[PDB]
Symmetry: C3
Subunit: 490 residues, 3 copies
């Protein structure tokens, strides 16, 4: 039974964008690049303040008595081995996002410097990206992951975000407004969040193509068309297979750069980027548009605030995944797992790519070149022996990522587009994929030169509504837990 | 029971110094500016070290099992309500200075910079101000007020500074060599503290009168015209019982303070004041230790004088109010829990202050940034109003800022003038009106007395003297830190 | 009993290194300098990373439930009682360098500045030295001293060091390709280190004996002979515990010239440096823990090579003797009580030591009276106290100090190396221990010839290069210390009770939601 009460109000907005954006582009590119400014100016304090509130909240919940509570029936144990569990989180924190920013993120920070500091600064270059890909995001994925796991396993509600809000709102199934609105926002967010990955991943393919068979905007459509097409072919079975073919390619690329690049230096950056990240954490936690001397405003809009929005928009999906994979875990074991494990991949993957990118800058090999993030990865690879064949596998890996990232995404979307049915309808899954690949393709076309700007801009806008929901999820979750049987028994 | 035995040495010493101030003169203006510089040069290390140990100690103790143990028989609903339990604490410890320094403190640090930092650093500016007004001070308040509220409302010992040390002292020798000298220092430092913070506070009101009185602050006419309205503003708030006086007075003060802050928040630079919430907190945590460890040995041995004007002076300043502030914080929490009490005198005056400073100092800095500075000549008393007048409805709001200056002083005087009578009556919670009104009119006398040297000066002088006289107290809070653990331990 | 499959191949390599130094040099000198220049370069990242991990590990372990697990059978009271307990730990712990470094290292960082900072940074100066001399080096010790203490006393195996790896590789089958090689490295690393510390220790005594004029040579060979004779005796006067006299005497003396430079020198400038040092330390903690050769801007390669990475790789080489020696003394003390007697206390005295000595050295530097004498660490100690009322008179006890401060690291060391030669026993046994002592001195003054200073300076470099695998040992010792610790009866009994309570409570719960759910069907 497809809950149309949600499917359509979320299809109105998804279509409206792929309507007043693709053809009627002027009003789109304009409205977007000003609406993004509206929220970053008056709501940046929100993304920032609550962004670190999540990391605290979630840590104190782990350390709380709630930690011993078991996501499932009383004294229930896990469905999988711990190491099997961990390896599903290692692969959980991997994909387009790390491909695209792995090289340019720390690079840009080193080359252009950071508000509150100066250029050519490794420590700050590294600890800043650590900031963007470690504790902060996964706290959000933990908040949403936990809320879902708890409501669907421990209390046996529907696997919908709306359900996690029962303690506060419900008010029955919280139906009508709110319950529907929460899940409606959950859908929208998931779409644009993944549309932001499918998008820039598609324009990292294009840039990669300029390293073999060889800017024509048409190609981007050509790219998306084939990938979104393979998405439909492989949505009839699969994800479990390619998500395993991803970890070989990715490991091949990383292990490659690690050996064939400045091995010792990359290694140096492990303790470095972790030691810096802990030293600067709160300084970074304290950067708003008021620093540095009312100057760090613009930067924050293009990094810290963007990411924050993107992480929050991707929490309905990633939250589902973790919950769906952590049944039987204690709340404490869950939190610590979701925080510490995924961040291991980030830390390493950035030290591998962004690490050698920094070393090339210092040694005059600079792979910057016109400063187009999209074509920086291949810039890196090419500077390494055998990096001409690696630059291709890098594309084939982005290709496979695109698909799987859209399989898993749409599954979760179908799941919440019909009363939280785990049994995903193979049609309502595909219907959400090509719909996501639409706005992914829309943000690319509507911008051209900028592209990446609007691709980051609108997601910042599609996410801001859902920020307040995650914020409320903190309240909906302390109530559930303090009303738990075990906690009332202790 | 008019204790007695200790009032003699007090009254005569508070009298001897006030004669040294109006009589000999100069030789007393010599002491203040040299004695203070003496303690700050030598005991400086002991203020900033045990200053950060005071903070980690109450945190550890509140997070410990002892946090759960109530401060009563076991079942005893708190005498006063919640939002007033708080109001009373904040509005009793905090003086008038929060009114001005909320603007000056941040603005100054921004303009000039602080040791080991370049100027115009917004983060460092908010951080250092918080470091001075948030966690640290309210720790050297909690530690005293807790030791007391426990020594009495849980053990039973008379509400006296000597009883809290019983677990260390001869357990009854708290009425001899030390016991006496402690209750004496506690009243001498409580009389002086209230003395100058009264008359000298009346001067702040003088300059504050810039949109109303408009000079020349009729030399002494309006200064005495303020000391009168002020002295005859409390003394009744105290003797009329906390019920309508202290309690209701402190709740009004908070509502107006709240009201004023909300004004400059909405009409002022909102999204900026809003950004300085994470900015201030984040920078605070980020800078906490490097400033917890800023000593006169940095930078390269230069911050000594800056510390002498700020950090250290404050630690001595607050240590100088603990006697009568911790005494009032205990009496307002009959059946409060140690854990809640602590995170009720720490984790809320800190919140309040952080919001306060971010709103006022944040605005002062947003103006300074857009070239529309409100520094003007650099006087504290006028910066606040200069800040207000710059906003629509500023002149109007100026008058309720004036009301706030009075209330912010009086709520501290009336509340602290009750404790003057209690520690002069063997430690009676309830005190005779004729004694708590005598100690309020015997300080207004010495405060109004030092208005003979033209004005100010001697008031600021004896202030500094009170600090060097209340310096022994730093060692009290260290030891009180010991006679609270080796007392909470011998519980049940 | 004696282990002639460990003690034998130990001597065959401690002698092949002799020939390397004396009968060759160059190939010795150059290699000894080209080797650590590779472990610093290639394994530096790991020294740095795990050095900080160590600190956290035994800190959580301490505050953990494993915390109150007595070191030895449940009852059992301390064998020495405190005071002298931590007193001798600091004795086997910090050599003669705490003297000629506790004063010159704060000054050198202040005067030359530290990577990522300007010079004359009093904060960073006190900050960085603590980083090298407090929490990070004593973690390396407590971990080793814990694995071993728990292993021998609580469980009940040999004092031998590979008795801590039975948890990972066999109840005793950990004997062959590994285990005995761990013992063989330990016995080697101890012989070398106790030898160099004797040669370079000696070369210093004289270079510092110019306090209260003649150079060195020969009249310095007589100095090593009063030490190599005083640390071997020891042996008796215990029995085997003459260490108490000396070790527990480094308080009255060291506290004496400490309280001297404290009251005579700039008392307030030191006092101020107490919060200044702690505060700054905590503040720069993770910054320093993050500092590698890729920061700053790819520049701090050499400074770390000369300072931090060399320090870490140095404490890891020393870890065996201290870890082993820290095993006893601690018998009958909580995992917690032991972790705080190896961390907080030594870290607390080192702070005050650096504040007073290294502190005034920074103060004189500020007022113009620089103590920096051509950059010689030897004189700088004496050159400083010479500038104080009682300069020569204290320079004497400072000289008696650097003398006793050495033999405490040799008398205990010998005790240990002798223990790891006789199947890990705890009794004196005069010789063997004394046999390891004289044989230690052999290289001390044999290396000294044909090579000059480079002899002991390159040997003590090689000692490290052949002790770097120990890094990995202290890494794995974490996995053993916890895999072992978690099989403790008191603990197994603890969690087993928790498991039962989880089941039982669930039983009560699940039988109530039945009663009241049908009891609530009675209210149809
Ligand atoms: O998930 C296990 C939990 O572990 C403890 O805390 C959380 C585990 C911390 C380690 C997390 C790491 C694992 C993943 C990778 C990095 C992080 C307790 O809260 C405990 O109550 C909890 O469960 C414990 O394990 C027993 C095994 O069934 C339980 O029966 C329960 O009694 C408890 O002892
Ligand atoms: O650009 C580097 C390439 O040239 C050589 O470099 C060596 C090697 O990388 C050599 O491995 C390196 O030092 C070794 C690092 C030791 C750390 C050991 C870890 C390595 C892999 C993870 C587990 C253990 O130093 C050199 C400089 O990088 C290598 O031989 C490789 O061909 C390749 O790494
Ligand atoms: Cl449970
Ligand atoms: Na007040
Ligand atoms: Na020693």
């Amino acid at each position: 039974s497809l809950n149309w009460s949600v499917i359509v109000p979320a299809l109105v907005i998804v279509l409206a964008t792929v309507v007043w954006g693709i053809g009627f582009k002027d009003s789109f590119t304009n409205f977007a690049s000003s609406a993004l400014s509206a929220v970053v100016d008056n709501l940046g304090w929100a993304f920032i303040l609550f962004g670190t509130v999540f990391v605290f909240f979630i840590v104190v919940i782990a350390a709380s008595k709630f930690g011993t509570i078991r996501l499932g029936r009383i004294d229930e144990a896990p469905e999988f081995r711990t190491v099997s569990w961990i390896s599903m989180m290692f692969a959980a924190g991997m994909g387009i996002d790390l491909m695209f920013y792995g090289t340019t993120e720390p690079l840009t920070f080193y080359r252009n410097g950071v508000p509150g500091h100066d250029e050519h600064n490794v420590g700050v270059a590294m600890s800043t990206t650590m900031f963007h890909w470690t504790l902060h995001p996964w706290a959000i994925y933990a908040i949403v992951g936990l809320a879902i796991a708890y409501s669907t396993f421990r209390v046996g509600r529907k696997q919908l975000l709306s359900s996690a809000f029962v303690p506060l709102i419900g008010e029955k199934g919280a139906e009508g407004w709110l319950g529907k609105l929460i899940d409606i926002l959950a859908i929208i967010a998931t779409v644009f969040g993944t549309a932001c990955s499918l998008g820039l991943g598609a324009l990292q393919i294009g840039a990669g193509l300029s390293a073999a068979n060889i800017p024509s905007d048409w190609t981007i459509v050509g790219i998306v068309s084939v990938l979104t097409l393979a998405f439909i072919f492989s949505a009839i079975s699969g994800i479990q297979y390619l998500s395993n073919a991803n970890m070989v390619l990715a490991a091949l690329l990383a292990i490659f750069v690690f050996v064939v690049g400045p091995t010792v230096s990359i290694l140096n950056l492990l303790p470095g980027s972790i030691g810096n990240y802990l030293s600067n954490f709160f300084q970074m936690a304290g950067r708003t548009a008021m620093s540095a001397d009312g100057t760090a405003g613009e930067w924050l809009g293009s990094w810290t605030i963007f990411y924050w929005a993107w992480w929050i928009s991707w929490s309905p999906f990633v939250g589902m995944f973790l919950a769906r994979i952590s049944r039987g875990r204690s709340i404490r074991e869950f939190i610590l797992g979701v925080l510490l494990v995924p961040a291991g991949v980030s830390t390493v993957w950035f030290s591998i790519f962004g690490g050698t990118a920094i070393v090339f800058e210092q040694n005059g090999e600079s792979i910057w070149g016109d400063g187009a993030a999209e074509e920086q990865l291949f810039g890196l690879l090419h500077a390494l022996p055998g990096g001409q064949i690696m630059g291709i596998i890098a594309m084939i890996l982005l290709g496979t990522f695109f698909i799987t990232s859209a399989d898993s995404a749409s599954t979760v979307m179908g799941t919440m587009s019909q009363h939280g049915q785990l049994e995903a309808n193979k049609w309502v899954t595909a219907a959400w994929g090509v719909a996501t690949a639409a706005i992914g393709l829309t943000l690319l076309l509507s911008g051209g030169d900028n592209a990446l700007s609007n691709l980051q801009n609108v997601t910042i806008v599609a996410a801001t509504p859902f920020l307040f929901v995650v914020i409320g999820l903190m309240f909906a979750l302390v109530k559930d837990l303090s009303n738990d049987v075990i906690y009332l028994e202790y």
